[PDB]
Structures are given as C-alpha cells and as structure tokens.
Design a protein around this ligand. Structure first.
Ligand SMILES: [Cl-]
Ligand SMILES: [Cl-]
Length: 162
C-alpha cells in the first residue's frame, strides 16, 4: 500500500463527468473540475485540463495522468504551507500518506480548521488526535472514508485499507 493505491480506494475511478459527494463536477480519480453548477463550465475545464475536445469523457490513461499531477501538487502544497510543513515533517511514512489524503480531499484551506488536531498529531498523541479529528463536518459528511484515514493516524498501519 502506498498513497496512490490508498487514494484510488477512497475516490474510485470514473471516466465520465460525475458529481462528487458535495455535488461538484468531478472526473477520474477525484479530480475536482469546478464548483459551478454548469455542466458546460465543467466540460470546458475538462477540455482545458486534457488538452483535447473531450465531450465529457476521458481514457484511463488520461485519468491517471490527472491523478499523478494532483498527488504531486497535494504534496508540494503541503511542503509550501508553513502550518503544514512541520506536521508533515514530524510524521512517519504511513501517517504522511494519511495527511496527503486529507489535503487531496479537502485542500490546504479545508485542512485549516484542523489546527488543534494538527498540533496533537505533531505531539504524537494518537488517540487524542483521533477523537479531535472526528468532531468535524468532514467526519460527519464522509464517515467511512474519515474513519479509515483516522485509523491510519491512530495506528500508523494500513490496516483500515487490507
Ligand atoms: Cl489541471
Ligand atoms: Cl465515506
């Protein structure tokens, strides 16, 4: 198990534009296209992301390509963010995958409300951090995925995911 297989389990793969859990147009492996309601605005951003006229449909390779770019940028934003960096640096390899997972799903911006949980992870207080992480809209909205990520932070193993 690695970051790629972990996110491919949490996000799935869809080759046709679909709506995510919050109702936004997405395609591939969790690739958010737009927060607008317009299917047209979505098709447009998609064509722009792929470099071809797609008509809302892409190939597996194209999806994987978008996925490689998005993990890379998730990582790189963590590294550039001053509150994130130090958390990330302090963690072991499994827990780092859990943090990237959070960032990919919710952006540096969503992850901003985790000030308290981030401090707890940094201090390595696993059980407390797991309790604090659960008190969030995130956990209430996508409980099964949250529980898997949460368990990865609590345990430091990939158990939630075999
Ligand atoms: Cl893009
Ligand atoms: Cl879920």
């Amino acid at each position: 198990m690695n970051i790629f297989e972990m996110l491919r389990i949490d996000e799935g793969l869809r080759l046709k534009i679909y709506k995510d859990t919050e109702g936004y147009y997405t395609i591939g492996i969790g690739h958010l296209l737009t927060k607008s309601p317009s299917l047209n605005a979505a098709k447009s951003e998609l064509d722009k992301a792929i470099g071809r006229n797609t008509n809302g449909v892409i190939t597996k390779d194209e999806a994987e390509k978008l996925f490689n770019q998005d993990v890379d940028a998730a990582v790189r934003g963590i590294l550039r963010n001053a509150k994130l960096k130090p958390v990330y640096d302090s963690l072991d390899a499994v827990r780092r995958a859990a943090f990237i997972n959070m960032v990919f799903q919710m952006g540096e911006t969503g992850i901003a409300g985790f000030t308290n949980s981030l401090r707890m992870l940094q201090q390595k207080r696993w059980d407390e951090a797991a309790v604090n992480l659960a008190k969030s809209r995130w956990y209430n909205q996508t409980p099964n995925r949250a529980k898997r990520v949460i368990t990865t932070f609590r345990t430091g193993t990939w158990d939630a995911y075999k």
